[PDB]
Amino acid sequence: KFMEFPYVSPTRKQLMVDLMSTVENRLQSQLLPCNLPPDVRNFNNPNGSAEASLHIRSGDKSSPIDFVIGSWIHCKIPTGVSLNITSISGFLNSSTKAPNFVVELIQSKSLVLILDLPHRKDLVLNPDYLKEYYQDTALDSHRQSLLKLPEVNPYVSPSLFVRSAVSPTASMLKIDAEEEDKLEEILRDHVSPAAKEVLEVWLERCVKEVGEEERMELERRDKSFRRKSIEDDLDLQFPRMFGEEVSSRVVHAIKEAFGV
Amino acid sequence: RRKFMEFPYVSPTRKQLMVDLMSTVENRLQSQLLPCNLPPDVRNFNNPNGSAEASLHIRSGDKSSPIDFVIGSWIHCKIPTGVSLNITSISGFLNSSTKAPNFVVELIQSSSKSLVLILDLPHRKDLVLNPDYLKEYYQDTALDSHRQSLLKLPEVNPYVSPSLFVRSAVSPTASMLKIDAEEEDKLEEILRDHVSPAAKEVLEVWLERCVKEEEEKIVVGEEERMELERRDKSFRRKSIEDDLDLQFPRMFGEEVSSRVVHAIKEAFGVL
Numbered sequence: 117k118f119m120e121f122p123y124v125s126p127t128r129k130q131l132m133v134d135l136m137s138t139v140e141n142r143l144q145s146q147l148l149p150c151n152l153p154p155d156v157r158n159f160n161n162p163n164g165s166a167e168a169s170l171h172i173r174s175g176d177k178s179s180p181i182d183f184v185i186g187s188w189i190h191c192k193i194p195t196g197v198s199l200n201i202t203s204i205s206g207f208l209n210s211s212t213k214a215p216n217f218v219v220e221l222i223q224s225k226s227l228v229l230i231l232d233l234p235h236r237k238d239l240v241l242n243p244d245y246l247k248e249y250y251q252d253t254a255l256d257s258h259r260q261s262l263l264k265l266p267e268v269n270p271y272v273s274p275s276l277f278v279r280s281a282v283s284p285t286a287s288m289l290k291i292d293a294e295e296e297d298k299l300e301e302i303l304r305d306h307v308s309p310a311a312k313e314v315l316e317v318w319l320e321r322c323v324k325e326v327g328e329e330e331r332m333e334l335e336r337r338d339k340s341f342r343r344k345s346i347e348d349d350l351d352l353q354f355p356r357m358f359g360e361e362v363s364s365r366v367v368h369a370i371k372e373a374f375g376v
Numbered sequence: 377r378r379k380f381m382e383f384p385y386v387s388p389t390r391k392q393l394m395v396d397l398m399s400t401v402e403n404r405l406q407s408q409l410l411p412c413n414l415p416p417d418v419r420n421f422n423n424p425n426g427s428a429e430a431s432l433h434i435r436s437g438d439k440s441s442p443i444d445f446v447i448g449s450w451i452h453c454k455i456p457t458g459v460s461l462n463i464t465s466i467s468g469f470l471n472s473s474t475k476a477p478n479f480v481v482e483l484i485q486s487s488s489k490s491l492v493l494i495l496d497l498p499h500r501k502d503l504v505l506n507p508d509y510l511k512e513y514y515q516d517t518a519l520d521s522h523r524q525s526l527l528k529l530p531e532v533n534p535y536v537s538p539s540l541f542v543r544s545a546v547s548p549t550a551s552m553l554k555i556d557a558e559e560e561d562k563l564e565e566i567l568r569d570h571v572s573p574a575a576k577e578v579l580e581v582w583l584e585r586c587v588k589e590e591e592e593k594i595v596v597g598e599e600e601r602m603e604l605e606r607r608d609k610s611f612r613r614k615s616i617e618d619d620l621d622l623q624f625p626r627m628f629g630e631e632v633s634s635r636v637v638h639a640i641k642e643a644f645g646v647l
């Protein structure tokens with residue numbers, strides 16, 4: 117089961133369930149049921165070194181939603197330590213210009229947070245967009261509030277594309293606690309409220325209530341992001357984690373959902 | 377009274393860096409740049425009351441150049457709190473006859489405590505839509521190495537601009553940094569031994585990879601050229617209203633400001 121998040125802490129799992137529940141409850145009427153094959157919703161490497169679940173609901177064509185994607189990945193690296201990734205993303209279609217949503221936690225007392233509403237128009241060409249969705253919404257405050265904590269530092273992605281893809285208000289953070297319980301405290305009292313308010317902004321100001329050429333560029337740009345990210349993050353790493361057989365079907369199903 | 381290349385009010389090392397950079401720009405772009413033709417009262421100007429002083433140096437590219445213009449400035453302002461604002465900047469702007477990145481180096485000090493460095497080749501295409509542009513100009517170059525190198529210094533920390541627009545306009549490899557300025561001798565060392573080589577090396581990439589006195593083509597395609605022109609125009613208009621319209625009348629008075637802002641607007645082609 118997806119919602120059981122069985123390889124992460126109770127605090128982290130609770131955050132992911134709260135988030136996914138909010139997404140599914142608020143967008144009930146505009147979300148289709150998950151149409152992924154059973155062997156793509158829950159899968160593993162034949163050798164047992166990695167395990168993952170995938171939850172994708174397409175949006176209704178008359179809604180602003182392309183799809184929502186939730187995932188957890190567990191990989192036992194040969195060394196003995198486990199990589200746990202938990203993520204929820206929201207993708208909007210070309211009927212709206214509004215930003216996307218992403219929350220991602222990557223953990224090997226150390227943890228990377230990616231929390232953002234990624235822009236879907238060029239911010240330099242379109243400063244009104246920047247004002248509407250980021251300046252008027254106080255999204256930057258979450259980044260700043262988190263950084264005040266001694267164990268929270270900036271995370272600078274090795275991917276220049278990831279750096280370019282996220283908004284100027286993105287919380288790209290590395291959390292380095294002295295113990296496990298300190299990190300857990302940060303998750304419940306700081307990360308959790310932050311992720312929940314960013315989600316609220318997305319639902320109310322982005323999803324909630326266009327130019328012919330504007331939509332054409334939206335799809336072109338949307339596709340460029342999805343295609344490139346899949347190339348960078350999936351094409352090499354999934355065959356490694358799960359084996360070529362399991363990867364081929366899963367990535368095919370992901371590509372189909374992403375429309376690439 | 378004080379001229380552009382005199383860089384008054386700043387430390388000897390800050391002056392030297394700015395002199396070195398502008399001299400290199402002009403010397404290396406001899407086949408590109410027309411003489412400065414700003415009138416004397418736009419080249420050097422001040423608030424009549426003495427509270428602010430500035431100098432402006434603009435050289436436009438010739439008709440057939442990829443260079444739109446290069447612009448140098450220094451600004452000194454006496455803030456009513458008794459501290460002084462000192463800005464020194466050099467920017468290279470390319471026109472729509474090339475897609476290649478721009479060049480910027482800025483040093484900003486408004487308190488005794490910290491010197492802010494902005495050092496970048498700002499991108500001129502959407503990097504998400506155009507990942508090939510991202511690879512060509514930022515991945516394939518060593519631009520990020522300079523940011524990493526500078527950041528290793530104990531006195532150097534990330535600078536996060538209050539302007540979301542500034543954050544969006546700089547490249548993913550930009551050195552946006554804040555340098556501890558309490559120890560004067562240390563700041564000089566950081567400027568001389570680390571910031572100076574980095575800025576010169578970033579300029580070198582711009583000169584050789586962006587301006588590229590090579591096959592002066594590609595002839596930029598119709599659609600590409602028009603998008604460059606629109607995005608360039610948007611950036612410039614926005615930058616001026618954020619940093620010039622809302623500050624220059626206050627610093628220099630309406631008389632001097634209207635004159636200087638006009639000249640800047642003319643060079644930027646938003647006039």
Ligand SMILES: C=CC1=C(C)/C(=C/C2=NC(=C3\c4[nH]c(Cc5[nH]c(C=O)c(C)c5CC)c(C)c4C(=O)[C@@H]3C(=O)OC)/[C@@H](CCC(=O)O)[C@@H]2C)NC1=O
Pocket residue numbers: 432447448449451463465467478479480482484486494498536537538539542545546615616619620623640
């Ligand atoms: C790619 C090119 C450039 C980029 C990316 C760029 C960025 C930044 N410059 C800022 C500022 C700034 N710059 C100038 C010089 C100047 N600007 C123009 C046009 O724009 C002209 C024509 C001239 C001189 C003739 C002044 C006066 C001035 C400020 O007052 C302001 C500032 O620091 O307040 C204390 C910062 C704004 C946000 C922040 O506070 O972080 C930010 C770091 N500045 C670029 O030129």
Ligand code: NA
Pocket residue numbers: 262263264265266267268269
């Ligand atoms: Na911190």
Ligand code: NA
Pocket residue numbers: 526527528529530531532533
């Ligand atoms: Na440092």
